[PDB]
Design a protein around this ligand. Structure first.
Ligand SMILES: Cc1cc2nc3c(=O)[nH]c(=O)nc-3n(C[C@H](O)[C@H](O)[C@H](O)COP(=O)(O)O)c2cc1C
Ligand SMILES: Cc1cc2nc3c(=O)[nH]c(=O)nc-3n(C[C@H](O)[C@H](O)[C@H](O)COP(=O)(O)O)c2cc1C
Ligand SMILES: O=c1ccc2ccccc2o1
Ligand SMILES: O=c1ccc2ccccc2o1
Lengths: 359, 359
């Protein structure tokens, strides 16, 4: 099975091609993770996936999506990850982390508590920042504060500090969150970036925050550990071919700047779009990015059907298959997939205290 | 759905009729549990089952099955359970524990490391104890030491101390392991008990260890928390009707002595038997015990098919359905069962960070 072939990137070897993508849990308190996360993540690692990427973890308090988001903006925040990293490694999975800044989509309620911008008089909320003072709209109506050049310098340094902390906590894989309409994506998109300084206007200027942040992170992140990013390569906003062309050009510049793998997604920069949701719908666009930027990729959405994951790999659409919600449903999805695909000794996807009894 | 109806026993209410029976993990060190158990048990509790019974936990070092078995023979052993109990409660499941003594089946290898009695010159092994100096046979050839009256007194006190420790660690449900050919079962069975003192020969004498142990435990175990036992009610040894009759009589004496629920099993006292394994095969015998002893019951073996669990409950064969291996395969089996049986808002079997996304 292609799904169960190992994968080596830099000095890291994944035991199979199943990646668990970042999935916010909304269970942290002032950014500090707790036994929710410990058990959730260790349980997933034991389920057999080769790579487990921790949820969007804010590089600064105002870069959380919600009051429940994880953070890594101090050394105490980082040290809370150490036992979890160690548990993921004990289970034979590779521990990764997505470091993030929610930009104009920050200061929102948890998804089961309204999913919308927090009311102005709610003591939990905060002012959001963005390249330009323009609201997302819809359920996120707050107008963010336009960043100063000093704010840009500060946020880049927060990404550096976050990467340094992730390294020192023992993570073996890092993902910069430049997707999903959050701060990085919003610098790239002309919808959200109306700046007329070095950080907006032209393709080079819109790319600048993302490229500078990547380069700054690269200074502290070990060359022997995968350096990755998530990036929305189109919006489904009626501008798709031009946007895809620019996104692929940026992917080439990421590769030249030391990016080892790109997690290919959708922008979600603005609400007025027409996204053609369907099983593995991103496969062909991931394949195009992979081919035209000559860079390994992953993608997500609907790959919880094992045969579809297998097909995407065999078609060389993807190098790793990211499987999210199916792992919330069943932490042992990798074992289910091994059985489905007829892998020999499928139960030994799991550790011995489970595997022995399920043969 | 009957499977998703709550159940109240004494002061304890289970949110549904799904019980996770004790399942040895073989991951403890000198009886001390660790993060294997913490994550395993907390993950299961979050999966939605109403009751989670911790694996056979030895009341004395020589009563472990294997070198990997959990123990509760000192206060330090008991205190290791406290964070796990607290995690199970945080997830809304009821924490239980099975306290045990392996008798002549002790000093064995882990099941994936031979499953047989440990060699005499292996430094991990120990002398086993039993009512009579008679080996099980087959892969368990060691002849146990015949217990003295002082040994009987000591082991009863070890059960008391174990129950006291379980209580003080916060467990809300206790199960005495009088099944599966271990010490208690072996006192009851004429195959293994050839004593001619007060603890063998007659039905009353063979029952005595079990009844005295129950009564002694009852002195320290709170009256408002379920007091239960697991007991093998037949052997499939060609003596089934007579053995069933005696076992039901013992069940009546357990009930009279304060037992709240009986987990009905097979004896596994000797190897030369013909057990008719099949899905829910114990249902009719559990039903007979339930009816003739007028005592709530659970049973196990093959109830991981949700419709079969439901049928057993609707037929009043069982009060709780024990589902073991299916939970090793999928910690979230209760969610799977809720979907299968068409329960409304099935995803809310799970906590919010999962349930919201799986609706
Ligand atoms: C509960 C949950 C939280 C999510 N949090 C993030 C996040 O932290 N970062 C991110 O880039 N994507 C996040 N996503 C997107 C997932 O990583 C994944 O791309 C999406 O769920 C599609 O994959 P699936 O169909 O296998 O679930 C989240 C999705 C879910 C369901
Ligand atoms: C891994 C494992 C460990 C077991 N350990 C115990 C134990 O600690 N105590 C016990 O009474 N039964 C133990 N059993 C029996 C289970 O409790 C259950 O009765 C049996 O697995 C049948 O249920 P199932 O078909 O749902 O798996 C164990 C079974 C398995 C598979
Ligand atoms: O980047 C993100 C962060 C959270 C999240 C939650 C649900 C769906 C997608 C998501 O993407
Ligand atoms: O009482 C027990 C203890 C361990 C065990 C392992 C596999 C099957 C049944 C078992 O029963």
């Amino acid at each position: 099975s292609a799904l169960f072939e190992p994968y080596t990137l830099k000095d890291v070897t994944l035991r199979n091609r199943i990646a668990i993508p970042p999935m916010c849990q909304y269970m942290a308190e002032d950014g500090m993770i707790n036994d929710w996360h410990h058990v959730h993540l260790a349980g997933l690692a034991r389920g057999g996936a080769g790579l487990l990427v921790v949820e969007a973890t804010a590089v600064a308090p105002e870069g959380r999506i919600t009051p429940g988001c994880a953070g890594i903006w101090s050394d105490a925040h980082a040290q809370a990850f150490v036992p979890v990293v160690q548990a993921i490694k004990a289970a034979g999975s590779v521990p990764g982390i997505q470091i993030a800044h929610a930009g104009r989509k920050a200061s929102a309620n948890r998804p089961w508590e309204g999913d919308d911008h927090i009311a102005a008089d709610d003591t939990r909320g905060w002012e959001t920042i963005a390249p330009s003072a323009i609201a997302f709209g819809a359920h996120l109506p707050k107008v963010p504060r336009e960043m100063t050049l000093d704010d840009i310098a500060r946020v880049k340094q927060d990404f550096v500090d976050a990467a340094r902390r992730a390294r020192d906590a023992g993570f073996e894989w890092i993902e910069l969150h430049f997707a999903h309409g959050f701060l990085g994506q919003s610098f790239f998109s002309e919808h959200s970036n109306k700046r007329t300084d070095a950080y907006g206007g032209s393709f080079d200027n819109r790319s600048r925050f993302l490229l500078e942040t990547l380069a700054a992170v690269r200074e502290v992140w070990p060359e022997n550990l995968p350096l990755t990013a998530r990036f929305g390569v189109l919006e489904y906003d009626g501008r798709d071919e031009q946007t895809l062309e620019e996104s692929i050009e940026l992917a080439r510049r990421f590769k030249a700047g030391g990016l080892d793998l790109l997690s290919v997604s959708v922008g979600f920069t603005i609400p007025d779009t027409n996204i053609p949701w369907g099983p593995a719908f991103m496969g062909p666009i991931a394949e195009r990015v992979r081919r035209e930027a000559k860079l390994p990729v992953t993608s997500a959405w609907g790959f919880g059907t094992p045969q579809l994951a297998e097909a995407a790999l065999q078609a060389n659409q993807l190098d790793l298959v990211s499987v999210g919600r199916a792992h919330l449903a069943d932490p042992h999805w990798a074992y289910f997939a091994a059985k489905e695909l007829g892998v020999e000794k499928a139960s030994w996807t799991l550790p011995a205290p489970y595997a022995h009894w399920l043969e």
